[PDB]
């Protein structure tokens, strides 16, 4: 009959890996419609918007995600990534450092992803 | 490659 929020997040995830980013973001939006209290739907959609260069939309989604889950490592990382592409370097670095702390606190292991992003955040800032 | 990248949806 109808897709559940879980079906739609699953569809969006497959579309995301398929580099179908606008279609993926619409699936996450439909998941939000069915349950607007899931931070992960918003951080997932934020990352689509990043891939689509719609940074202002990505910011908004990260901010909504932080209202729902203040501990979200990816909400902080995508926020830092977004502010980085917008030449907002001090805010980007702060958010990447905050993702790093939260990931350590939550025992998440993204390898060197967060330290690498921080090095680029500081390098790009210095080169500017 | 043993860790999934952070640049990915959940």
Numbering used by the authors:
A (entry chain B): 23 to 150
B (entry chain E): 633 to 642
Sentences from the paper on this structure:
Many studies have suggested that CHIP (C-terminus of Hsc70 interacting protein; STUB1) is one of the major E3 ubiquitin ligases responsible for degradation of tau5. TauC3 is the product of caspase cleavage at aspartate 421 (D421) in tau and multiple lines of evidence suggest that this truncation plays an important role in neurodegenerative disease. To explore these questions, we focus on a cleaved proteoform of tau (tauC3), which selectively accumulates in AD and was recently shown to be degraded by its direct binding to the E3 ubiquitin ligase, CHIP. Here, we find that phosphorylation of tauC3 at a single residue, pS416, is sufficient to weaken its interaction with CHIP.
A 1.8 Å crystal structure of the CHIP TPR domain bound to a 10-mer tauC3 C-terminal peptide. Key molecular contacts with side chains were also maintained, such as the “carboxylate clamp” interactions, involving coordination of tauC3’s Asp421 side chain and carboxylate-terminus by cationic Lys30 and Lys95 side chains in CHIP’s TPR domain. However, we did note a few distinct interactions, including between tauC3’s Asp418 and CHIP’s Lys72. Critically, this co-structure also suggested why phosphorylation of S416 weakens binding to CHIP. Specifically, we noted that tauC3’s Ser416 was in close proximity with CHIP’s Asp134. Thus, phosphorylation of tauC3’s S416 would be expected to create interference at this site, likely involving both steric and electrostatic clashes. To test this idea, we mutated CHIP’s Asp134 (D134A) or the adjacent Phe131 residue (F131A), to alanine and tested binding of these CHIP variants to tauC3 peptides. Fortunately, installing D134A into CHIP was tolerated; for example, it bound normally to WT tauC3 in DSF experiments. To independently verify this finding, we performed FP assays and confirmed that CHIP D134A bound normally to WT tauC3 (Ki 5.57 ± 0.34 µM) and that it regained the ability to bind phosphorylated tauC3 peptide (Ki 1.84 ± 0.23 µM). Together, these results support a model in which phosphorylation at S416 weakens binding to CHIP via clashes with D134 in the TPR domain.
